Every structure is written in C-alpha cells, then in structure tokens.
Design a protein around this ligand. Structure first.
Ligand SMILES: *Cc1c(COP(=O)(O)O)cnc(C)c1O
Ligand SMILES: *Cc1c(COP(=O)(O)O)cnc(C)c1O
Lengths: 350, 350
C-alpha cells in the first residue's frame, strides 16, 4: 500500500522515528510510456511522462509540503504562512488542514484574484488583502515568523526541495536505471535542483549507473536563466513558470552544468502545441507550464539533437484541471450540423 | 508497481491474455482515514475517504472507460461515440486518445457550454453541435453504431459498470475487510450498482466477512429515485448528479434493498457544507457531487443513526479542480487590512 513519500523514502529525508507524518498519499504518480506521442513527434526512443498532476492538490509541490508541514508540526508550529497566489499556497493549505494547523496567506490587495486563490481558500486558508505593496507585505510575513510560532513556507524553506527530490527516486525505482535525459519546466528552479540532487543520491549509492542530462525549459518571455539576467516583467501563458528572478537560479545552473544538460527556452506557441499534443496522443491532461518539458523535447528532436534509442523522462508538473482558462482558450469551435444522419456521417470521416 | 485496474483485477473482468490493455494507471487512489473530519462532525468511528479525484481524468469514470475502450480495441472498433457533456465524455476521450482511436461527441447546439467540453476537446474529441434536440442526436449516435465500427460509450455500454466495481475491490484490499456502510453519490446510479456487485464478489470469495449497507445520496432537487418518479427538470449545483431519469434506477433500488441500505437525499446547502468541510478538515478537494456522500453521513450522524464504532467509507467521485465555478462561488472575499504589523496580527489573532 502506498503511504506517502516520507514513509517510502524516510531514510533519504531529515526525519526520524518520532517525526509526525502529515501525508495525503502524494507521490507514486504514473510514469507513463508515451509511444503515441513519440510517434507523433518522430522521437526514435522511449518517452516516459511523470504525471505529477495526480498529486493531492494537483501539483508536484505536494512533495515538498508534506515534508515542510510535517517538520513544522515536529517543531511545534501552530500554523503556516504564505505569500503566494499559486500552487504553493493551495498545497501548503491542504497540508496545514491535514495537520490540523491554521494557514495564512498575506498578499497585496493588488495581487488578489479569487480564481487563483479558491483552492487554497476552500482548504481553509485565511487570505488577507494587505493594502500595500508586495515587499510591503513580505515584511509583515517576516515579522510574524520572527515573533510567533508560525511556519513560513516560502521558497526559503529547505524541506520543499528535499521532499521534491523523491520524484527522481520514483523514476529510478520504476525504470530500474536513470534516463539518458530528464526534461523539466523551470520557474523558480527548485524542482530541477531537487531532481538533480535526487539523481546524484541514487548514483552515489550505486542504485543507478549513469546520471541523466538535465534539460530544463523556460518560456521565451520569462527566461532569465537562459538569458543570464533577471526579467523585470516576465511574460507567458504558462503562469507556473512566469518567473523573472528564480529563487534557485544558482543551483539550477549547477545542475545543468554537472549533469551535462542545459536550461533553454521555448515559445508560448511551442508550449501550447505540446500542451495539446500530450492530451490528444496519450489522454494525459497537464497544465501549460508542465507542457514546456515536452515542448523542449520536440524542439531538440526537430533540431536533430538525438542519435536514436535514448530514454527520456518528462515531468508534467501540474494537473490540466488547474487551468480551465487556457483549456477553454485553445478549444476550437464545435462544428454545427443539421439533425441528419447522412449529413453527420458526412461531417465525420465515414 | 501499479499498472492499472485491468491488470490488477484481471480475473474479475471480461478479458483474456490477448485483450489489448489501454490504461492510464487509473485506480489505486488513496483511501484516506479522515480523523479530523470524524472529530469535526462527531462521528464516533472510522471514516475513510476514497479520493477518486486523483484518477487520470479527474473522476472514477476512468475505471469504466479503461475496460470499455480496451474492449472496443479488441473488437476492432475505430472510434468511440457518446452524447454527454460531462465527465463521461472527457473520460472516454482520454482513453480513446491513449488507444489511438477517434472520439466523437454529438450534442444539441443548445447545451454547448464550452467550459464543460474543454477537457474532452483537448483530448481530441470531435464535438458536433446538432441543430436539434438531445433525442435527435441520440438517434444519430445509435444509427452510427449500427452502421459503422464505432463503439457507443454511453450508459448502455456494460463494461463501464464492470470496470467501476474495482473501486470496491480496492477498499476491501486496503482495509483487509469491508466497511459497515458505504456512502456514495447517485446520479445515473451506475457506481452504486458497481460497488455492490464488487462487495458481493469479495464476500462470496471470503475476502471479507461482511457486506456493507449501501447508502446512496442524491441532491433533493434531483432525487427521482428517492421520490419514485422521474424529475422533468432536475436541479442542483452538483452537476454530476443532476439526473432526472437515472439509467441504472432499478439496479440502484436493488442494491439498497439487498444490502440493507437506502437511497436518500441531501440539500445543496448540506452538500456545499460537506464539500467545504472535507477540504478544510483533511486537505482533500473533491467536486460538489462527490460531497453528497459525506453530506449524507453528516445527516445520519446528527439524526443519531449510528451507535458508535462503525467503519464507514465514502466515495469522493471527482476532483475539486473539475468545478472551478463552484469553488469561486463559495469563497468569501479576502479581508482588507492596512500594512500595519500589529493590525494584521490583530486581524489574525496571535
Ligand atoms: C511551481 C510549478 C512549476 C515551477 O516549479 P519550479 O521548481 O519553481 O521551477 C512548474 N509547474 C507547476 C505546475 C508548478 O506548480
Ligand atoms: C458520473 C459521476 C457521478 C454519478 O455517478 P453515477 O454512477 O451515475 O451515480 C458522481 N460524481 C462524479 C464526479 C461523476 O463523474
């Protein structure tokens, strides 16, 4: 029986026999062999899609929060506090509810938008609209953590990356060896960092004989790592990776460098093409940001990057049900047809 | 290790060693012990939530579609077809894509509300807006199946209920025994029927020492099974159970009678309370219809139904990410607070 990532990989995590485990059975997500997709893009090798959208709150972030909240409970924290309007906030809230802890979200009145906060809110998170600026409100978040037993779960929390490395463990456990390449979307770059650390651990332990080349992918209008300098106003339909100054920038470059990989960019058009193709070839629905990994692969295929026979794994970071707006946006118009058998058959290719 | 429900429960299904298995790794969803929820509603026993929202397309229907589509391939069908605007169509489309088959959806141009078809469409379903009624489109779908190798995957397809019975197998496998009661939402009633069939099979094999009383739940504004007569214009915010003339009506009545349970109703207000409470006490986000099961449980606990010590399982049929509109609707607007630490702290109460 699957019982969460902490119980499965406890010997690799900063926990012990007394650490309280707050889990929603995250992890152990499908590693789907995508032969239809491979044929559709002309990739002469095996493609495996790690479908993280099936995690409890719809994002791989759950891997980090289970450990982060568990450690918080162990430390006697009475609540968690966040300053995010995305998957981070929803994930932290879910685990806080599971742990019986309070969850607080402080954001500037301007960054508030119910659509992006509904999930976190239903989890029980108390959202405050700070009548001020972004950094204005982060100061308040900081002051709370310094003065009260409230756990800050921003990027600064080291347990998030630690829990996230378990995705690499699962790929290696399932395949029996590491892939030749691992494709992953890159926003704040914590995930690519985590996977690399995960692969190195299994390698240092002798569980795998080779280390995958880490191929990270950013959206064109928000590719500070690819360019080498921060992006003031990052732009991209893939909200999850719309980051101008990634928190884990340094470790991400090290991961690409050590693994012999690279962090590159793809356009929103290429991202949407992959987003749709993944669903129409394999019946796997991920969110736009997740598709960047496959879009990256498609790009390299067309450029004649591969020699043939390589094994590639792609992280589909979030559930496509996370983004109903983009889903509706890419939908063509339903073809209108008269109530006539023969006409219908005519429209269809019969 | 998990490879889908067909491979896991092959001996219980109408398949042989030569049947092509089209799977998306559906099934084996978390059976979450909800102690926080139990304490929150005063239930003096054990509550387990079967979180079906984590299935590949967001609902338990994936269990039926994996078999239905696999059987269609085996039969040499070139496509699948239905006339649904809900989870049925999305599920069928995803499995058709996985199987490399085409998927067609015929619906009256009227009911066409894009948000409800976006998922089926991204999976590659070809949706036709028929300038007629539901009955006109239904006859065209029938004529298509009688004249072409296109598999009808609506309610009449027997494989859906067969694949769905695996949910009960999983519950019994995980617990090592059957629950005293099983709470489940009831729309067309195929799921309740499937679970009952599943429990009886394990009982007959001796894998369980008891048979669960089946407790089905409908929304009061659409409870034809409860009232005994079709509901011309069913109403409820829980769209997945907004069914006025359930296809498996007779089977549901039999399941309730034979198991010693019953099919009852709960108000939308009671459903929404459950929907929110499940999320805030456990960090589990299911869609409204799914919450009907817990709402039913809450109703009975308050009415003094239980005696204490009973084990109850609840099927949370769909992912909360399936219904963004209701999620936004139940959310209170964030509280506006000045950028003053003491004020913020005063608002939260530390
Ligand atoms: C957070 C998130 C990302 C970005 O992850 P990083 O570690 O910041 O690069 C990508 N996709 C989804 C769905 C996310 O939630
Ligand atoms: C189909 C569906 C139901 C109703 O299932 P029935 O077997 O028709 O009673 C309930 N919830 C969700 C999420 C569904 O997709």
């Amino acid at each position: 029986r699957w019982q969460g990532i902490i119980k499965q990989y406890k010997k690799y995590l900063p926990v012990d026999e007394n650490t309280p485990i707050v889990t929603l059975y995250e992890g152990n997500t499908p590693l789907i062999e995508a032969d239809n997709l491979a044929r559709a893009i002309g990739f002469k090798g095996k493609i495996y899609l790690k479908y993280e959208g099936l995690n409890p709150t719809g994002s791989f972030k759950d891997r980090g929060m289970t450990l982060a909240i568990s450690k918080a409970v162990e430390a006697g924290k009475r609540a968690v506090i966040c300053a995010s309007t995305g998957n981070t906030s929803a994930s932290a809230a879910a685990y806080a509810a599971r742990a019986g802890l309070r969850a607080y979200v402080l954001l500037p009145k301007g960054a508030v938008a119910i659509g992006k906060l509904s999930q976190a809110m239903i989890y029980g998170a108390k959202v405050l609209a700070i009548q001020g600026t972004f950094d204005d409100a982060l100061n308040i978040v900081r002051k709370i953590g310094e003065n009260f037993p409230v756990e800050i779960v921003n990027s600064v929390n080291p347990y998030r990356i630690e829990g996230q490395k378990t995705a690499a463990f699962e790929i290696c456990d399932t395949l029996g060896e590491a892939p030749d390449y691992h494709f992953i979307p890159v926003g704040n770059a914590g995930n690519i960092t985590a996977y690399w650390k995960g692969f190195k651990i299994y390698y240092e332990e002798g569980k795998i004989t080779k280390l995958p080349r880490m191929m990270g992918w950013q959206a064109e209008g928000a590719a500070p790592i690819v360019k080498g300098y921060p992006i003031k106003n990052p732009q991209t339909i893939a909200t999850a990776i719309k980051i101008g100054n990634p928190y884990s920038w340094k470790s991400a470059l090290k991961a690409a460098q050590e693994s012999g990989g690279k962090i590159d960019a793809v356009s929103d058009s290429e991202i949407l093409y992959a987003y749709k193709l993944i669903a129409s070839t394999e019946g796997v629905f991920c969110e736009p940001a997740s598709a960047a990994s496959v879009a990256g692969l498609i790009k390299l295929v067309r450029e004649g990057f591969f020699k043939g026979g390589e094994v590639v794994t792609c992280t589909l970071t979030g559930n496509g049900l996370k983004d109903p707006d983009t889903a509706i946006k890419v939908c063509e118009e339903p073809i209108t047809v008269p109530p006539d058998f023969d006409e219908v058959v005519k429209v269809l290719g019969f």
